[PDB]
Amino acid sequence: SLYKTFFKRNAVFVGTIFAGAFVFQTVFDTAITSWYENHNKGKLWKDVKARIAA
Amino acid sequence: MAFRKSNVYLSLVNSYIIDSPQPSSINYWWNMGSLLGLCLVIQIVTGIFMAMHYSSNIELAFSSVEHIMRDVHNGYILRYLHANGASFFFMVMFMHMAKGLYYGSYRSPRVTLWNVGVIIFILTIATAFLGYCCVYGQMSHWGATVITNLFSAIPFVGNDIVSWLWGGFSVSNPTIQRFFALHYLVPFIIAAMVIMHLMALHIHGSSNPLGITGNLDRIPMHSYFIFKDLVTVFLFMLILALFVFYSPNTLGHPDNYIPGNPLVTPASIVPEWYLLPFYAILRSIPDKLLGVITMFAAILVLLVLPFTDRSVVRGNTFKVLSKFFFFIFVFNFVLLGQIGACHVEVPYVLMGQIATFIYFAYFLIIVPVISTIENVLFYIGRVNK
Amino acid sequence: WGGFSVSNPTIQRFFALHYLVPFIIAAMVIMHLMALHIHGSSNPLGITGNLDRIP
Amino acid sequence: PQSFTSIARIGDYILKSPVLSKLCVPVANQFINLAGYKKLGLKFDDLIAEENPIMQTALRRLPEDESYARAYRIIRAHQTELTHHLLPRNEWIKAQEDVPYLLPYILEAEAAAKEKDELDNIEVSK
Amino acid sequence: GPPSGKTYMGWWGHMGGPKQKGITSYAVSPYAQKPLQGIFHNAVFNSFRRFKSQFLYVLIPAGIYWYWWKNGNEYNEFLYSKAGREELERVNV
Amino acid sequence: GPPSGKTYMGWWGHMGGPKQKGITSYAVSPYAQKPLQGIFHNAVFNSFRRFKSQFLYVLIPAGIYWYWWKNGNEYNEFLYSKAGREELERVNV
Amino acid sequence: KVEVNLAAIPLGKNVVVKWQGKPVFIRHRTPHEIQEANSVDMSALKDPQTDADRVKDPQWLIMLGICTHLGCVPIGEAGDFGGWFCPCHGSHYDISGRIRKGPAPLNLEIPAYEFDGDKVIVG
Amino acid sequence: MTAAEHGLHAPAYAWSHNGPFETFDHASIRRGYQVYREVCAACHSLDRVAWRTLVGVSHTNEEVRNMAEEFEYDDEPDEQGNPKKRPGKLSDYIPGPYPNEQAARAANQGALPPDLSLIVKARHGGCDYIFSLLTGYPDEPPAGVALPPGSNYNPYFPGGSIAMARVLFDDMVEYEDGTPATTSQMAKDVTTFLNWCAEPEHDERKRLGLKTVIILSSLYLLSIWVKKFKWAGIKTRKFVFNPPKPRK
Amino acid sequence: WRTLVGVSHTNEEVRNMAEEFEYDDEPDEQGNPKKRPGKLSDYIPGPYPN
Ligand SMILES: CCCCCCCCCCC(=O)OC[C@H](COP(=O)(O)OC[C@H](O)COP(=O)(O)OC[C@@H](COC(=O)CC)OC(=O)CCC)OC(=O)CCCCCCCC
Ligand SMILES: CCCCCCCCCCCCCCCCCC(=O)OC[C@H](COP(=O)(O)OCCN)OC(=O)CCCCCCCCCCCCC
Ligand code: HEM
Ligand code: HEM
Ligand code: HEM
Ligand code: HEM
Ligand SMILES: COc1c(O)c(C)c(C/C=C(\C)CC/C=C(\C)CC/C=C(\C)CC/C=C(\C)CC/C=C(\C)CCC=C(C)C)c(O)c1OC
Ligand SMILES: CCCCCCCCCCCCCCC(=O)OCCCOP(=O)(O)OC[C@@H](O)COP(=O)(O)OCCCOC(C)=O
Ligand SMILES: CCCCCCCCCCCCCCCCCC(=O)O[C@H](COC(=O)CCCCCC)COP(=O)(O)OCCN
Ligand SMILES: Cc1cccc(-n2nnn(C)c2=O)c1COc1cnn(-c2ccc(Cl)cc2)c1
């Protein structure tokens, strides 16, 4: 359920905003890096290193 | 009673930020003082973490700031947050002083609260000057030459303050080493003046935009103004982050990326933007001793303000002529900063002289004459005769 | 260390911390005298001293 | 602040003058309604600052029917600003109700303070 | 310690105003009022009302100081051109 | 601010002891008493009296710790001489 | 203080020596040719100063480089004779050190150079 | 001052790293080091750039190890206290052509060519000024000007007269990818390389600026909602006055 | 050298003592090394280079 099973208890209320603070941390960090290296595709070092493969 | 009111240490927190009685009609201009407490914390913390990597010798000082930018892990974040944080610290303090000049906060019984504030403003100017000379760029050497040469004009003791400020015969290695040691210290004197500032506030409390007594309607600090203080903190950190990460050299000068040289002078010597109005007051006086008196008198004329206001109402909410001349004084202070960034040419030596006259005539002439005119106009517009 | 032994990053950060902790000590001295003012001092007899006080 | 004895000394000279009250009283009535305190339900004597011993004397000597009504007008004016509105035009202060209800208590508290102070600084000889 | 000099503010219970008698107040909980009611008829209309009152005390001092800067600026660009070469003399010294 | 939790000390007038009744005190000014009277009958005897009370609580713990140091020291000088060369072995390891 | 002997400065070399943290202009020149530059009159200029306390050593050239406003720096061996081109906010100068250009109120300073034992201490 | 003494104003070209979401072009940094090594290193130094910082940005590891080995560095002395040399390694800094400042002015007629490690951030204009300085030498000076002996006219320099002559011409380098090396093409690549030498944190900075602004804007929007919920009871509070009966 | 004047020798003696040693000077107009005799502000030299 919700608030009395999810946002009331102090090992749930505070034990979600400190436990969910890590699972939010990495999937937000991964999805930001995927957008940045796709908006700027073709100019990175990874792209021009595979072009000097001769 | 509760534990937060019987402990010796928790009761000070409870009597200041939890159960403090506030006037319920204050607006977002009363949020600038808490935001200045966050500005002092950012400047002390980022400066201590940068002092672990800095060398104050005159042949190692410029290159060690480059070492922080290139080699230290996240070292560019520390410097950019420090150099841009000093401009944000001065912008909120100009808005803090202008609120109390508007709503009449400098009058009885808050005269001592206004006098401790003037001392903090002088120590914040001295702090930013000392730290700007520690980079030892080309603007750092010639800004410290011009300022320290002003004290050679004091009568009968002139060649003894300047040789004691230099440690030698010019701006040299003893000058840079002693400027960093004084730069570590004055931020801790400012923090002790901030404690004495909040003591004088607790015995009388705040005013309100109406300007009358506020003891008839009070709400506590906790759960009502902590969530209103939180709004302007998140707006502050977002505009500060836009400068540190997207335009970090816009409030600066490119001549500070040249190492300083005593044998080559720059073509244009211009201070930071918050010292430009006071730089233009100095160049307007043709004498050398009279010029250094007038530039320091532009800050000590704020102490004559409780005596020249002859009004019987506190503030500027219902005063028509006093609201007009408040914005004459504001835009004259933005014209003074623009003159101080220009060359010394001949439309501009007379514009900067008349505008220095409007600075001193507001405090000593315009305020005591317009104050007593509105006392008589309120009287004859009411008394039927 | 800031590295692999006691080296140049160790000496530079030790001086910056040495400037700072004397100012933390002075703030603990202020909090020390606050806890003294609410109860006062004892005496070599070890009993109550509220019957004979001088300024 | 100037004093209320000095204000009325200047302000009475304008009203017993045929050519001065011609010029200044049309200007003074425009200064009143450009202040805007009547739209918050306030008289002028509510706006006077009260943290001085002459003004604290005049507030004790007020009758308590006028003292209760003044405390409600001030509370109504604080709640009006935090909503950033004005009052309805039914509840504005009209021009006949803005009377100097506190000026007689003020002017006699000042004349007694002047007389006491000029009897402490005396040079009577033989 | 000892009591110090008296002020013009107190605490909860003895704040130090006049005595009150005959004023009533009412309120309703925030959990019973609709979420974000006062977001319209206020900055779209109310701050548009508060601007229109207090703007002419700002824009008339602003217009004098911007006329003075723009008119003083274009006389400097004239003095440092070829057409303004003789008037740079007899003015500066 | 508000009043805090109560302590076991007050100030002048309400210091917080028991009520007193029936004790008298007298004194004479310092300008009437002779200069430096209590300089003899003071440390030449008084402090010679106060030492003799509280000295045996100091000198018996001191004598045990100085016997332990002097006896442990002279066994170290014996072990690092030529006569104590074999007893350095079979003791250290 | 810097000691100069009577052996080690030839005629035309304006080296800008960083003495005492300050720039200076050092060369030896003929004692005849300043009859060419300042033969105007006494007081055609701002302050009345032509030759008297110009050089107490009449056959040398010594001059500081700190200006009244800022302390600007010229280029050497360029001018009418090879003197002063100081393009900073104003004045150029001559062999002596007085103006050909610009307002320039006050005169640049002559330092105190003395004579000890056939040695010349500057400052 | 006059516009001749201030210098011409550089225009606004459209660089590929302008904008809040843009990256350096690492194929224009790679070609920019080729114009530094062949045209520029004869008179200018690069004293703030180490060899190891190029690996993963414009070259690979085996290439920078081969590049650094054709220079001679001074080693710690041998067992008799005599000097000794050694080839370069990755931790060294890129060398310059002159040993001291007097030898630099001796080969450039008194003038001193500056260090190019921070020249982008130390000039009014930035990338637009260094590009317009090189591709801005006229074929003839304007009529009426008089240049000193050994000078060149360039209107982007304050004063008009500069001690550096034109050094870029057509087809003076030969690129490895096959790009036509014209005057404006080679001048574009030095300014992209030299901007990296001043700001090597540029691509890392704008990626952490994305995470901070998204987080702090969603914290600023939630604080406005939270404040108006807790302030609802004060804005809707009411007040009625009934005058008391008057003999208290 | 200057710290011996007034303690164990006179001024003309320490100037004569310091002059029999060779110190390195700032380079000439071509960037070549140059030597000079000693003065009072110099430090007393040692026998080995490293
Ligand atoms: C350097 C950056 C530091 C960052 C902090 C600086 C902020 C200082 C700005 C000056 C200021 O304090 O503003 C006060 C005044 C308005 O205050 P007020 O109480 O009369 O009316 C509040 C409203 O009615 C209710 O506001 P409400 O409480 O209903 O909603 C909260 C509001 C938050 O907005 C703010 O924080 C205002 C700063 O949410 C929104 O508005 C939604 C927006 C999408 O504003 C004005 O009257 C005129 C503003 C001119 C600013 C001039 C600045 C010159 C540099
Ligand atoms: C010597 C050193 C002293 C410090 C420097 C002196 C001047 C520095 C200038 C920096 C501060 C800029 C603004 C000045 C401070 C504003 C404080 C103030 O005036 O607040 C009250 C005023 C009233 O607005 P309300 O409508 O809310 O109130 C109703 C009538 N009382 O609220 C208002 O602000 C009115 C609304 C107009 C906006 C104000 C800012 C105008 C923008 C241009 C200012 C120039 C800044 C670059
Ligand atoms: C109110 C507090 C402070 C203010 C207003 C202030 C101001 C400044 C300013 C304006 C600069 C010039 C930065 C630049 O232009 O690049 C600077 C430099 C510097 N300051 Fe601070 N400072 C404060 C506190 C401190 C403290 C407490 C320390 C030391 C612990 C410190 C250490 C430094 C250092 C190391 C520099 C080095 C140069 C640099 O980083 O650019 N600062 N300071
Ligand atoms: C580091 C510097 C400062 C800090 C931390 C600071 C802090 C504060 C705080 C927290 C308040 C109460 C909240 C408020 O009224 O907004 C306040 C009010 C006030 N400050 Fe400051 N302040 C500083 C500098 C100054 C300066 C420079 C001045 C004036 C020259 C000044 C004058 C005042 C006055 C008069 C008030 C009372 C205003 C009122 O109650 O209406 N302060 N300050
Ligand atoms: C910089 C360090 C310190 C300062 C300035 C300081 C200062 C003082 C002062 C002024 C008193 C008043 C009574 C007297 O003068 O004897 C006092 C009492 C006292 N101090 Fe400290 N002190 C310091 C460190 C310490 C330490 C390290 C301890 C214990 C671990 C301590 C524990 C106490 C106690 C228990 C008292 C009360 C004694 C009594 O009233 O009988 N203090 N201190
Ligand atoms: C791709 C090659 C080059 C680039 C990007 C370049 C760039 C620059 C820049 C930005 C300046 C400074 C402009 C200023 O001070 O405002 C400069 C100055 C100078 N450069 Fe170059 N340069 C290059 C090649 C050369 C060469 C090959 C020489 C000499 C043979 C040279 C000699 C000089 C000199 C003498 C100056 C000083 C100009 C003055 O101060 O008047 N440069 N160069
Ligand atoms: C109007 O109502 C208000 C109000 O709004 C506010 C905000 C306040 C509160 C205001 C303040 C508390 C401002 C006062 C701020 C200070 C005195 C600054 C204190 C100084 C510091 C915090 C600097 C010291 C910091 C450190 C020592 C930490 C940094 C050093 C580190 C982390 C060492 C690193 C080394 C290692 C090995 C980790 C009120 O008191 C108040 O009532 C009046
Ligand atoms: C994220 C949250 C919301 C958003 C932003 C809001 C931030 C909220 C947090 C704010 C931080 C809390 C502030 C700390 C505090 O308690 O404030 C007290 C400071 C004011 O002064 P004082 O210390 O009360 O002086 C009070 C005084 O009592 C201190 O001095 P005293 O002890 O009397 O002297 C004793 C020494 C004697 O010395 C001598 C020798 O005289
Ligand atoms: C110069 C300014 C200095 C800054 C002072 C600002 C105010 C002090 C900091 C505010 C936060 C204080 C946190 C302390 C938490 C409460 C402590 C407590 O429970 O009181 C004590 C226990 O505290 C300790 O043991 C030492 C505290 C270490 C403090 C280290 C910072 C319990 O005391 P007790 O419950 O008996 O109440 C009696 C009242 N005299
Ligand atoms: C001149 C110059 C030229 C170039 C850079 C700077 N400069 N010095 N510090 N900062 C931050 C800065 O821009 C400066 C100094 O400008 C000014 C102007 N007024 N003051 C001033 C006022 C009061 C005090 Cl107590 C100390 C100094 C200093």
SS (H, E, C) B236-273: HHHHHHHHHHHCCCCCCCHHHHCECCCCCCCCCCCCCC
Q: Do E25 and H239 touch (CB under 8 A)?
A: yes
* Three-class DSSP category at H220: helix
Q: Which residues pair with G15 in a beta bridge?
A: G26
Please answer whether residues A49 and H63 qualify as being in contact, where contact means their C-beta atoms are separated by less than 8 angstroms. Answer: no
Report CB contact under 8 Å: D84, E17.
no
- DSSP letter for A51, please: S
How far apart CA H153 and CA H163 sit, in angstroms, is 9
| Nearest CA among B56, B80, B82, B72 for reference residue B136 | B56
Apex CA B285: angle with CA B279 and CA B286, to 5°?
Answer: 120
Q: Give me the catalytic one of B140, B207, B272, B311.
A: B272
Our answer on whether the CB atom of H113 is closer than 6 Å to any ligand 6 atom is yes
Which residues of G are marked as active site? Answer: 89
Expressed in angstroms and rounded, the spacing between residue B27 Cα and the centre of ligand 2 is 13
Give the phi and the psi of residue B19 in degrees, each rounded to 5.
-115, 30
Ligand 4, atom 8, residue with closest C-alpha: B33
Looking at beta carbons, which residues of chain H come within 8 Å of B227?
223, 226-227, 230-231
Q: Is the CB of C29 under 6 A from ligand 5?
A: yes
CA distance C22 to C15: 12
Query: What was the resolution (in A) of this experimentally determined structure?
Result: 2.6
Looking at chain H, which residue has its C-alpha nearest residue I29?
H102
- Experimental approach taken: cryo-EM
- Which residue type is seen at D71? A
Q: What gap in Å lies between CA I23 and CA E8, rounded to an integer?
A: 78
Distance CA G25, CA G85 (A): 13
Ligand nearest the Cα of residue B125 is: 10
* Pairing label, strands G2-5, G119-122: antiparallel
Tokens of G62: 């010594």
Rounded to whole angstroms, how far apart are CA atoms B312 and D2?
Answer: 7
- The Å distance, Cα B271 to ligand 10 centre, comes to 6
Task: Copy the structure tokens of residue G80.
Answer: 């009418």
Contact H16, H25 (CB under 8 A): yes
> CB B382 to CB D100 under 8 A?
yes
Contact in structure between H189 and H127 (CB atoms under 8 Å):
no
Upper half-sphere CA count for residue B70 (Cβ side, 13 Å): 18
Q: Which residues of B are annotated as a binding site?
A: 82, 96, 183, 197, 202
Judge if the beta carbon of residue B72 lies within 6 A of ligand 7: no
Return the ∠ at Cα B345 (arms to B341 and B348), rounded to 5°: 65
Measure in Å the smallest separation between the Cα of H79 and chain I Cα atoms.
10
B6 close to F (CB below 8 A): yes
How far apart CA A13 and CA A7 sit, in angstroms, is 4
CB contact (8 A) between residue C23 and residue B188: yes
Interatomic CA distance for residues B331 and B324, integer angstroms = 12
**Which is the closest atom of ligand 7 to the Cα of B202?**
43
Mutation target vs B (from D5, D7, D16, D21; most B CBs, 10 A cutoff)? D7
Verify whether the Cβ–Cβ distance B267 to G88 is below 8 Å: yes
E54 lines ligand 2 (CB under 6 A): yes
H124 touches B254 (CB < 8 A): yes
Crossing angle (nearest 10°) for helices D4-15 and B367-380: 60
Give, rounded to a whole angstrom, the gap between the first and last alpha carbons of chain H.
82
Of A29, A45, A47, the CB nearest to H56: A45
Instruction: For chain B, list the domains and their CATH numbers.
Output: 3-382 (1.20.810.10)
Residue F54 CB burial class (10 angstroms; 0-12, 13-18, ≥19): exposed
CATH number of the domain at E55, please. 1.20.5.210
Closest residue, chain F, to B199 (C-alpha): F1
List the single residue in B205, B338, B347 with the smallest CB-CB distance to E9: B205
Partners of D83 on chain H (C-beta within 8 Å) are 235
B27 in contact with ligand 1, CB cutoff 6 A: yes
- Contacts of residue B187, defined as CB under 8 A and 6 or more positions apart, other chains included, come to B40, B43, B44, B47, B127
- Using a threshold of 3 CB pairs under 8 A, tell whether chains A and H touch: yes
F9, F11, F20, F23, best to mutate vs chain C, most C CBs in 10 Å: F9
Size of interface D-E (CB pairs under 8 A): 23
Chains with ≥3 CB–CB distances under 8 Å to E:
B, D, F, H
CB contact under 8 A, H243 and D65: yes
Instruction: Considering the candidates B202, B222, B288, B323, report the single residue annotated as catalytic.
Output: B202
Looking at residue I2, its amino acid is R
Q: Which residues are CB-contacts of B340 (< 8 A; sequence separation ≥ 6)?
A: B270, B271, B275, B276, B277, B278, B279, B280, B283, B352
Q: From the list E20, E50, E53, which residue is nearest D71 (CB)? A: E20
CB within 8 Å of E10: residues ≥ 6 apart = B215, E16
Residue G103 CA to its chain's centroid (Å): 18
Separation of alpha carbons H64 and B206, rounded Å: 66
CA distance readout (Å), G76 to G14, G26, G109, G112:
7, 11, 18, 22
Chain B residue at shortest CA distance from F4 = B6
Using CA atoms, how far apart are residues B64 and B81, in angstroms rounded to an integer?
A: 17
Q: Give the residue extent of every domain in chain D.
A: 1-126
Taking the centre of ligand 6 as the mean of its atom positions, its distance from the CA of residue H6, in whole angstroms, is: 19
The neighbouring-strand residues paired with H162 are: H152
State if residue H119 touches ligand 6 by the CB under 6 angstroms criterion: yes
Report the C-alpha gap between C37 and E1 in whole angstroms: 8
User: Strands, DSSP E only, in F24-85?
Assistant: none
**Annotated catalytic residue B160:** no
D43 close to D93: Cβ distance less than 8 angstroms:
yes
Question: Could you tell me the distance, in angstroms and rounded to a whole number, from the CA of residue B197 to the centre of ligand 4?
Answer: 8
Range of the domain at E86: 1-93
> How many domains does the structure of chain F reveal?
1
Q: Delineate the domains of chain A, giving CATH numbers in brackets.
A: 1-54 (1.20.5.260)
B108 to each of B26, B211, D7, D14, how far by Cα in Å?
A: 19, 12, 20, 31
Contact B203 CB / ligand 8 (< 6 Å): no
Alpha helix (H) residue ranges in chain I: 11-18
What is the B48 CA–ligand 3 centroid distance (Å)? 9
B59 catalytic per annotation: no
Q: What is the DSSP letter of H72?
A: E
d(C-alpha H128, C-alpha D2), whole Å:
62
Q: Which chains touch C (3 or more CB pairs under 8 A)?
A: B, F
| Chain D residues with CB-CB distance to H242 below 8 A | none
Please judge whether B142 and G18 are an interchain contact, meaning their C-beta atoms are less than 8 angstroms apart: no
State the Cα–Cα distance between residues D14 and D25, nearest whole angstrom.
9
Tokens of B148: 């320290």
| Residues H241, E26: C-beta atoms closer than 8 Å | no
Whether residue B232 has its Cβ less than 6 Å from ligand 1 = yes
Q: Which of B67, B99, B206, B255 is catalytic?
A: B206
B276 Cα: distance to centroid of ligand 10 (angstroms): 8
Measured in angstroms, the CA of E60 and the nearest CA of chain H are apart by 32
Token pair 């930071």 is at which residue? B272
Token code pair at residue G42: 């006494």
State how many domains chain G has. Answer: 1
Sequence-separated contacts (24+) of D50-57 with Cβ below 8 Å: D50/B212, D50/B213, D51/B108, D51/B109, D51/E8, D52/B108, D54/D106, D54/D109, D54/D110, D54/D113, D55/D106, D57/D105, D57/D109
Any residues with CB less than 8 A from the CB of E29 and at least 6 apart, and which?
H233
Q: Judge contact between G97 and G37, C-beta under 8 A.
A: no
Q: Answer yes or no: are the C-beta atoms of B229 and B34 closer than 8 Å.
A: yes
Q: Is H67 annotated as a binding residue?
A: no
CA distance G94 to G84: 6
Amino acid at B162: V
Q: Is the CB of B305 under 6 A from ligand 4?
A: no
Q: Name the 3-class secondary structure at G23.
A: coil
To test the ligand 6 pocket, which listed residue (H8, H36, H44, H166) has its Cβ within 8 A of the most ligand atoms? H44
Q: Is C39 annotated as a binding residue?
A: no
Does residue B139 line the site of ligand 10, with CB under 6 A? yes
Q: Is the peptide bond before H200 cis (omega within 30 degrees of 0)?
A: no
Q: 3-class SS at B359?
A: helix
Q: Quote the CATH superfamily of domain D1-126.
A: Cytochrome b-c1 complex subunit 7 (1.10.1090.10)
Residue reference for tokens 């404006």? H184
DSSP character for D89?
G
Question: Which ligand gives the minimal distance to the CA of B138?
Answer: 10
Domains belonging to chain H, first-starting first, are 4-200 (1.10.760.10), 201-245 (1.20.5.100)
Taking only Cα atoms into account, the Rg of chain C, rounded to an integer number of angstroms, comes to 22
- Asked if B158 contacts B152 with a C-beta cutoff of 8 angstroms, the reply is yes
In this structure, what CATH number is given to the domain that contains residue G6? 2.102.10.10
- Closest C-alpha residue for ligand 4 atom 41: B207
Q: Whose CA is nearest to atom 40 of ligand 2?
A: E58
Q: From the list B216, B331, B346, which residue is nearest E62 (CB)?
A: B331
Calculate the CA dihedral of residues B114, B116, B119, B121 and round it to 10 degrees.
Answer: -60
